[PDB]
Amino acid sequence: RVNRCIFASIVSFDACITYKSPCSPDAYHDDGWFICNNHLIKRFKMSKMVLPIFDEDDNQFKMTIARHLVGNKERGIKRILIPSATNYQDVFNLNSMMQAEQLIFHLIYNNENAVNTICDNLKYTEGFTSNTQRVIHSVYATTKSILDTTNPNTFCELRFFDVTNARALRGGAGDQLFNNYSGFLQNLIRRAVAPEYLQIDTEELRFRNCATCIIDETGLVASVPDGPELYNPIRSLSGYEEYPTYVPLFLGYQIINS
Amino acid sequence: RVNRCIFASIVSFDACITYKSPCSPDAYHDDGWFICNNHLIKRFKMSKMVLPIFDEDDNQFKMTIARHLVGNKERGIKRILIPSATNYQDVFNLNSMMQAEQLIFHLIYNNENAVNTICDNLKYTEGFTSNTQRVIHSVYATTKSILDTTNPNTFCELRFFDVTNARALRGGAGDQLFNNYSGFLQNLIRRAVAPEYLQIDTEELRFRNCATCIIDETGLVASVPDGPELYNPIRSLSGYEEYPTYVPLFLGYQIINS
Amino acid sequence: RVNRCIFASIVSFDACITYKSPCSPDAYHDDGWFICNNHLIKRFKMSKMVLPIFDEDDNQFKMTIARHLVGNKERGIKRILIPSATNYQDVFNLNSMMQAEQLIFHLIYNNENAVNTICDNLKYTEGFTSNTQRVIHSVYATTKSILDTTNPNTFCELRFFDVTNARALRGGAGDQLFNNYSGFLQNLIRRAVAPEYLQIDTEELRFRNCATCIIDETGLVASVPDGPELYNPIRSLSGYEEYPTYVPLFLGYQIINS
Amino acid sequence: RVNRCIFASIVSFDACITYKSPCSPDAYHDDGWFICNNHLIKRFKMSKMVLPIFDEDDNQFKMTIARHLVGNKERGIKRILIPSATNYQDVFNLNSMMQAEQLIFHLIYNNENAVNTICDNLKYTEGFTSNTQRVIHSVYATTKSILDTTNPNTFCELRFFDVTNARALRGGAGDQLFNNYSGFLQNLIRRAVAPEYLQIDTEELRFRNCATCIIDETGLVASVPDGPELYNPIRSLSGYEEYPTYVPLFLGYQIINS
Amino acid sequence: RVNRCIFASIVSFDACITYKSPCSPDAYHDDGWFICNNHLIKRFKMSKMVLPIFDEDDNQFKMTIARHLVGNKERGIKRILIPSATNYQDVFNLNSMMQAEQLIFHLIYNNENAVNTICDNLKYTEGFTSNTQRVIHSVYATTKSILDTTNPNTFCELRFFDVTNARALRGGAGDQLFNNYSGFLQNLIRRAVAPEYLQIDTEELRFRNCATCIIDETGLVASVPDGPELYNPIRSLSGYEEYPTYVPLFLGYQIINS
């Protein structure tokens, strides 16, 4: 009944130009993703999927996994999925966006300087105190409400992104750089990439033979390790089921108790 | 329709003992106070009042002020209204409370050690994973939702608690120690004590001749400066209106623009 | 059933021009004030209030207190409430009034010379002996009846207006100059300003933190001590009671026995 | 029938967000102004007026003059009307605008670097070749069509902005800095400010006693010379005509032949 | 319903020649001007206008301003608007007028000698006592009725005509010579020229950049200071409002209270 997408609070507060709310109905669902599928697709090269685990509990245990939207022709920065705070200005092309969305992106990426600049140059516009202050108050408040509930400050599950001493707390440089992203970014990454190795109680399940995406200082980038880029039809004998060839986001390791 | 009191999320998660929701209907109102009047009275020696300002705008400008619940007989720590983080263990008598309320109080007062202790000794109880984890998750989540929206990190009004260079940003030790309280504590204090000097645009209004409460390292304490304690009937020629003799919370200075 | 206001006996004894009796119904009540609220407001910057004392007797003990009708913009002589006998000609603008009211004011202020002048120049008018003598007889008689019952000659309670040796009979210059006013003036002042310190039996109650009005040689003037003038809306979140911001008359000290 | 406003070709080429065409019907008229009144008001503090000249020819000779939209309270950069190329980033707040409008403004101000940046970072967006290239082609083509017809390269009237050797070609620093603006800026300025001294054939007409606006390195700014700012009601005995108190744009000198 | 123009009482009391009443209907209105617009135009080079003030009160505050009827070709005495008592014989060409109008002009200009001459040489005519005495009585009585209600003897607003110590009572020679005109002349001048600087309460409004007319010993003359004479079409792209180029009477300074 209430939208839970951080990009759902997008309004063009220019007082004469309109905006849109193209979020899919899945935004209202408390699936864990604080972003609707439509914005998850149009901004990141990412789509949502559910993943079933028919473990010994015989329960309908469902986790969340992601989907590439990048094929093979595009190389380099075009293959990125979630950029880090260092190099997202160029990839996101912030100037194309509306100020509500630049503010949301900077809050996601913790750019206090950018927020300060947008705030102290936005006051120069006319009609600011009439409704611009109230609307920016509303958008900033709801964005912080979405952001703080995902804050990585441990609550009151153990995830790793590299295979280094799997039966331990040791992690690679990917894990330590991933800890540097904000709460919303960390939550989105955690819900997006599923671990190719899962530890339930004391047993192990391997969903993917070998990792699909990679984590670098540039961020979550869909650059397949040690090989040519995986085929992706992108898209939008008949008796056998289709078995769609969509490439998922498989990376890391997980320790699960109880 | 939705409760906005931090003490409204009080549940006795002992699985057999009950709890209460004695919040007054004013909790649902978005008055600014993130606490219902009933808990504001039963925990702090504080009650709510509205205050009108018939300024040049001729608008129905209403601010929030507070009320003592302490008379004259009680002295010392009994006269405190909002203790600081240093000395609230003794005044609040935390052990009398339920664990939901100790957790709420420690979150209000930023006692990470106390939260860690309650979390790692609460897991020892039986039936924890069944519903205790879920209920503590709910209470902690709603408490952090209430707390973060009041966080003193400036948004995207200038309040002082001492008379030192009124036409400047200079403030006394009271202001600098008041900055040390958490977001909820700062918001409650700001909504509670009204400034005896108000600056609207470029003119000044003095509501109270001289300050009633005081701010010390012990906290907000209703110790009247340089004199015997103010009379307070506590309580719960007929033609003339009653003019109730309730003693309010008047302290500080305010700068208001537009 | 009988009016007890000194200004209720106002008649324009010009034999062709009319008069008014705008006294509120509280004039008939034997509240102690020998003046109706309407004249108390239109002549002095004063309004009536009752004040409750929920002392150890648990009785409905009500005293009388007053209210300013002056804001902040008016300064100097405009801020006076009850002028002394020295400087009331200018503030009251006696010439604007009718002769009944000048006579009443001079009787209140013990101006025997002014009464002599008005009496020996009023006889010059025509039709004097017909009814003017009888009507001036009636008004003077009722005015003296009101005045003598308030005469400060001790009857057959100890009030002070300065804080000098509170546990003694010592008083400041304000008390000794206040003794110089006539009986009606002293009674009106005593019923108007309530003591910020009250002594009941052997215990003390402080209603006001610090004094609001002041007593000078000019009289009772609403000049707040050592600070800018108190805000007063003058006039003539909704769930919480209004708590009107009317500024009262608090000054002095009282000793009460039994 | 065809729009002649440079700001009329404003389209939000984000492929899902809309735009507006709020130009007044005067845009279609070939009045000389290459901007509609609505954009002339919303972007510059400028409004349009016609000015009659009942000279010896007895013809209905009409010229174009402008109107301030700034009062007295706003000072400094807020008083500017047409900024120069040096300091228009801050006053116009380019980031608030859509890319069509930033491109139009940079083309008006001859910011080749800004155009290069917007062009080589706009290609990064998706769906660019589909319609974004065509729409940016259309907008850039029509903007250059509007700009080139106003190019200050003399065609195949003599205007000055300072009083220095009026009967000569000598001009102040204002004229030489005004020559530095682009064709559209020069045309807008020339149509906006009317010369307080006009020379028709061999005779002189003085419309304004003394100049209203000023020309500085900052640009056309409505800072009245040597005095407090002129009163301007802004806005949006009855028998006499209103004589509106709108403040016009009067500055300079003109030499007119035939 | 009753004419309030001093020139409306013009009758040719030659008993056989007629007269005219060409006053416009605005004469009946109590606008403050004691002269109809038709005579204000035909005698002085002056026309009426109203001027709006959209101050903070948001009220429809209208003052009175005047209009030149002189262009640029006429120089010297032809440019005068209201001559002083020293040099009005030549400019007004009194001999052209009828005796009613010479008498009115001398009464306006306080020429007791001229009135004495016209009275003691008018009695020489035949038929004087029949109706000439009665008609001259009527005209002189109504002229004095118009004149005395404008007498500069302060009633039971502070106007200056020079900029010398604006925040004070200091005034130039123009003010002291303007005090020398009669009541009707002073009232006409005050209603005619509007102050280029107005002080309302404690704030300042500048309607005109710099003064249009001037005050000299010769009188109110429309000689623009330090420059060539202002263009005036005299008289009696279509989408934009006309903005008439009529030159007003702006001079002086005003202090207004309440």
The string of DSSP letters for B151-195 reads -SS----EEESS-SSTTSS---HHHHHHTTS-HHHHHHHHHHSBP
Q: Do chains D and A touch (3 or more CB pairs under 8 A)?
A: yes
Contact E48, D242 (CB under 8 A): no
Which residues of E are less than 8 Å from D50 in CB distance?
Answer: 237-238, 240-243
- Separation CA A47–CA A69 (nearest Å): 7
Contact C188, C249 (CB under 8 A): no
Contact D197, D255 (CB under 8 A): no
Contact A69, A46 (CB under 8 A): yes
Q: Is there a contact between B137 and A115 if contact means CB atoms under 8 Å apart?
A: no
Among A2, A135, A143, A156, the strongest candidate for a mutation testing the B interface, having the largest count of B CBs within 10 A, is A156
Which residues of D are less than 8 Å from E229 in CB distance?
Answer: 206
B224 touching C (Cβ < 8 Å): yes
Closest CA–CA distance from residue C114 to any residue of chain B (Å): 36
End-to-end CA separation in angstroms for chain C = 32
Contact E235, E69 (CB under 8 A): no
- Containing B81, the helix (H) or strand (E) segment is strand B80-83
Selection from D199, D229, D197 nearest residue D212 by Cα = D229
- Separation CA D240–CA B225 (nearest Å): 66
HSE, CB side, 13 Å, CA atoms: give it for residue D95: 20
DSSP lists the bridge partners of residue E48 as E66
Both tokens of residue D222?
């409505």
Beta carbons within 8 Å of C257's beta carbon, 6+ residues apart: C157, C201
Q: How many CB pairs under 8 A join B and C?
A: 114
- Separation CA C98–CA A94 (nearest Å): 80
Contacts of residues B162-165 at CB distance under 8 Å and 24 or more positions apart, as own/partner, are B162/B215, B162/B252, B162/B253, B163/B197, B163/B253
B65 touching C (Cβ < 8 Å): yes
Q: What 3-state class would DSSP assign to E191?
A: helix
- Separation CA D198–CA D186 (nearest Å): 19
Contact D5, D23 (CB under 8 A): yes
DSSP lists the bridge partners of residue D206 as D197, E230
Method of determination is cryo-EM
- Separation CA E35–CA A20 (nearest Å): 65
The sign of the torsion formed by the CA atoms of C16, C22, C25, C26 equals negative
Q: Do chains C and D touch (3 or more CB pairs under 8 A)?
A: no
Both tokens of residue D142?
């029509």
Which residues of D are less than 8 Å from E52 in CB distance?
Answer: 233, 242, 244-245
HSE, CB side, 13 Å, CA atoms: give it for residue B244: 14
E149 touching D (Cβ < 8 Å): no
Beta carbons within 8 Å of D135's beta carbon, 6+ residues apart: D11, D13
- Separation CA B52–CA E42 (nearest Å): 61
Both tokens of residue C112?
């025997």
Looking at E85-132, list the stretches that DSSP marks H as alpha helix, in order from N- to C-terminal side: 89-92, 99-109, 112-122
In which residue are the tokens 């995406």 written?
A213
The count of other CB atoms within 10 Å of the CB of residue A243 is: 6
For A141, list phi and psi in degrees, rounded to 5. -65, -45
Q: Is there a contact between E224 and D207 if contact means CB atoms under 8 Å apart?
A: no
- Separation CA E218–CA E241 (nearest Å): 38
Contact E38, E54 (CB under 8 A): no
AA identity, residue D22: P
Contact C152, C183 (CB under 8 A): yes
CA E234 to chain centroid: 19
Beta carbons within 8 Å of B99's beta carbon, 6+ residues apart: B13, B118, B122
B140 touching A (Cβ < 8 Å): yes
Which residues of A are less than 8 Å from B155 in CB distance?
Answer: 137, 140
Both tokens of residue E58?
């948001």
In which residue are the tokens 């006539």 written?
C182
- Separation CA C205–CA C196 (nearest Å): 8
**Furthest CA-CA distance within chain B:** 65
- Separation CA D41–CA D50 (nearest Å): 16
What angle (nearest 5°) sits at the alpha carbon of residue B146, between those of residues B144 and B149? 100
Beta carbons within 8 Å of C192's beta carbon, 6+ residues apart: C46, C64, C65, C66, C81, C82, C220, C249
CA D241 to chain centroid: 30
A149 touching B (Cβ < 8 Å): yes
Both tokens of residue E49?
């206008």
- Separation CA E26–CA E20 (nearest Å): 17
* A129 DSSP 8-state letter: I
Contact A102, A115 (CB under 8 A): no
- Separation CA E23–CA E4 (nearest Å): 10
Residue in chain D nearest A78 by alpha carbon: D124
Closest CA–CA distance from residue D51 to any residue of chain A (Å): 29
Chain C: partners with 3+ C-beta pairs within 8 Å: B
- Separation CA D140–CA D26 (nearest Å): 22
* B43 DSSP 8-state letter: T
Both tokens of residue B48?
């709510």
Q: To what resolution in angstroms was this structure determined?
A: 3.4
- Separation CA E4–CA E34 (nearest Å): 5
Distances (CA, A) of C116 to A85, C120, C122, C183: 95, 6, 10, 20
- Separation CA A173–CA A171 (nearest Å): 7
Selection from E163, C244, E131 nearest residue B62 by Cα = C244
What angle (nearest 5°) sits at the alpha carbon of residue A52, between those of residues A46 and A57? 150
Closest CA–CA distance from residue A18 to any residue of chain D (Å): 7
- Separation CA C138–CA C146 (nearest Å): 12
B235 touching C (Cβ < 8 Å): yes
Task: Break chain C down into helix, strand, coil percent, rounded to 5.
Answer: 30, 15, 50
The count of other CB atoms within 10 Å of the CB of residue E210 is: 21
Contact D205, E231 (CB under 8 A): yes
Q: What 3-state class would DSSP assign to B207?
A: coil
- Separation CA D162–CA A59 (nearest Å): 87
Q: Is there a contact between B156 and A258 if contact means CB atoms under 8 Å apart?
A: no
Selection from E248, E221, E216, E243 nearest residue E232 by Cα = E248
Q: What 3-state class would DSSP assign to B78?
A: helix
Selection from D172, D166, D167 nearest residue D225 by Cα = D172
Contact E72, E228 (CB under 8 A): yes
Selection from C243, C235, C231, C230 nearest residue B64 by Cα = C243
Closest Cβ opposite residue C205 in set B51, B211, B231: B231
Distances (CA, A) of D179 to D54, D73, D89, D145, D152: 30, 31, 20, 21, 8
Contact B255, B205 (CB under 8 A): no
Selection from B225, B215, B223 nearest residue B181 by Cα = B215
Q: What 3-state class would DSSP assign to B50?
A: strand
Burial level of C226, CB count in 10 A (0-12/13-18/19+)?
exposed
Contact E172, E231 (CB under 8 A): no
Distances (CA, A) of A91 to A44, A79, A218, D152: 10, 10, 11, 40
Beta carbons within 8 Å of E164's beta carbon, 6+ residues apart: E170, E171, E172
- Separation CA A203–CA C247 (nearest Å): 76
For D142, list phi and psi in degrees, rounded to 5. -70, -35
Closest Cβ opposite residue E29 in set D212, D230, D239: D239
Task: Provide the b/e sequence for A132-170 (b: ≥16 CB within 10 Å).
Answer: bbebbeebbeebbbbbbbbebeeebeebbbbeeeeeeee
Looking at chain C, list the stretches that DSSP marks H as alpha helix, in order from N- to C-terminal side: 37-42, 89-92, 99-109, 112-122, 133-148, 173-178, 183-192
Chain B, window 160-219: residues with a beta carbon less than 8 angstroms from a chain C beta carbon: 197-198, 204-212
Distances (CA, A) of A71 to A45, A223, D106, D258: 10, 11, 36, 70
Which residue precedes each gap in chain B (C to N above 2.5 Å)?
156, 236
Residue in chain E nearest D232 by alpha carbon: E207
Both tokens of residue C235?
């006039």
- Separation CA C63–CA C13 (nearest Å): 37
Sheet holding A219-221, edge to edge: A80-83, A219-221, A214-216
Which residues of D are less than 8 Å from E241 in CB distance?
Answer: 49-50
Q: Is there a contact between E227 and D206 if contact means CB atoms under 8 Å apart?
A: yes
